[PDB]
């Protein structure tokens, strides 16, 4: 179906402890495929998925130089941002950037992104038009004015509509064994007595890929949203993800509760009950 390629970047200053640490990872969908960490002994962009390993030395050299250059500009940016916010040089601060592209089943651009956050807060974002900016505050407006003057958006649009989409197409083909396989959840319901009056029913989804999933409890056909504990979807470490949803069930009511599972690896949504 549809797919995404995203690059994530974080620089964290550490005054008195050297230069800011820079870490960047790239994903296709929910698959990590490259990483770079300036604190590695010999920083290089490194492969993290089998289908990128076939890229040749020129790819790794070029990607590594991009990463090193971004580490350097982020360090200049962190100095700039202290000025923009009238901050002291004494504290640690954070600069985050994400960019990339979403494509449909036919491979055409659906949406592009390029956005920054400073100290965990939105700073400046390229709008969906790939042509104008949303600045969060008067500091980010200074950046916006510089980027408008330099026609930065036009350069980003060209990457996001061109190279971004073409790389994603290549990766999806080279990785077609995995990137184009959905692993459905393995599902079951467990029962966990609390007291004589009530028990937890926990609906599990295990071993699934990609991470997107919907997992809901109904009672007598009514969604139990306010009364459901839904944990964040979590990595298993074998590419797959896990999730559970739990409800507190009065004694003897178990058969009134149904768990509902939606995942793109399932041809049809599942309904499950506790099976004593």
């Amino acid at each position: 179906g549809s797919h995404s390629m995203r690059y994530f970047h974080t620089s964290v200053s550490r005054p008195g402890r050297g230069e800011p640490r820079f870490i960047t990872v790239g994903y296709v969908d929910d698959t990590l495929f490259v990483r770079f960490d300036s604190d590695a002994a010999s920083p290089r962009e490194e492969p993290r998925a089998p289908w990128i390993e076939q890229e040749g030395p020129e790819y790794w050299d070029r990607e590594t130089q991009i990463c090193k250059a971004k580490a350097q500009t982020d360090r200049e940016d962190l100095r700039t941002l202290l000025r923009y916010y009238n901050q002291s040089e004494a504290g640690s601060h954070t600069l985050q950037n994400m960019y990339g592209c979403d494509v449909g089943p036919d491979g055409r651009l659906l949406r592009g992104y390029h956005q920054d956050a400073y100290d965990g807060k939105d700073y400046i974002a390229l709008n969906e038009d790939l042509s104008s900016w949303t600045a969060a505050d008067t500091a980010a407006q200074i950046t916006q004015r510089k980027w408008e003057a330099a026609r930065v958006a036009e350069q980003l649009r060209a990457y996001l509509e061109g190279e971004c989409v073409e790389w994603l197409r290549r990766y999806l083909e080279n990785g077609k064994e995995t990137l184009q396989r959905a692993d459905p959840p393995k599902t079951h319901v467990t029962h966990h007595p609390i007291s004589d009056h009530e028990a937890t029913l926990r609906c599990w989804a295990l071993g699934f890929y990609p991470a997107e999933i919907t997992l809901t409890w109904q009672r007598d056909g009514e969604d139990q949203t306010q009364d459901t504990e839904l944990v964040e979807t979590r990595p298993a470490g074998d590419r797959t993800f896990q999730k559970w949803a739990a409800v507190v069930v009065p004694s003897g009511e178990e058969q009134r509760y149904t768990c509902h599972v939606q995942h793109e690896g399932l041809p049809k949504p599942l309904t499950l009950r506790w099976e004593p």
């Binding site: 990607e63 991009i66 390029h114 920054d116 190279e163």
Partner: peptide
């Protein structure tokens, strides 16, 4: 493959 266009805030 990455964006190769240095940008400064």
């Amino acid at each position: 493959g990455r964006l190769n266009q240095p940008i400064k805030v």
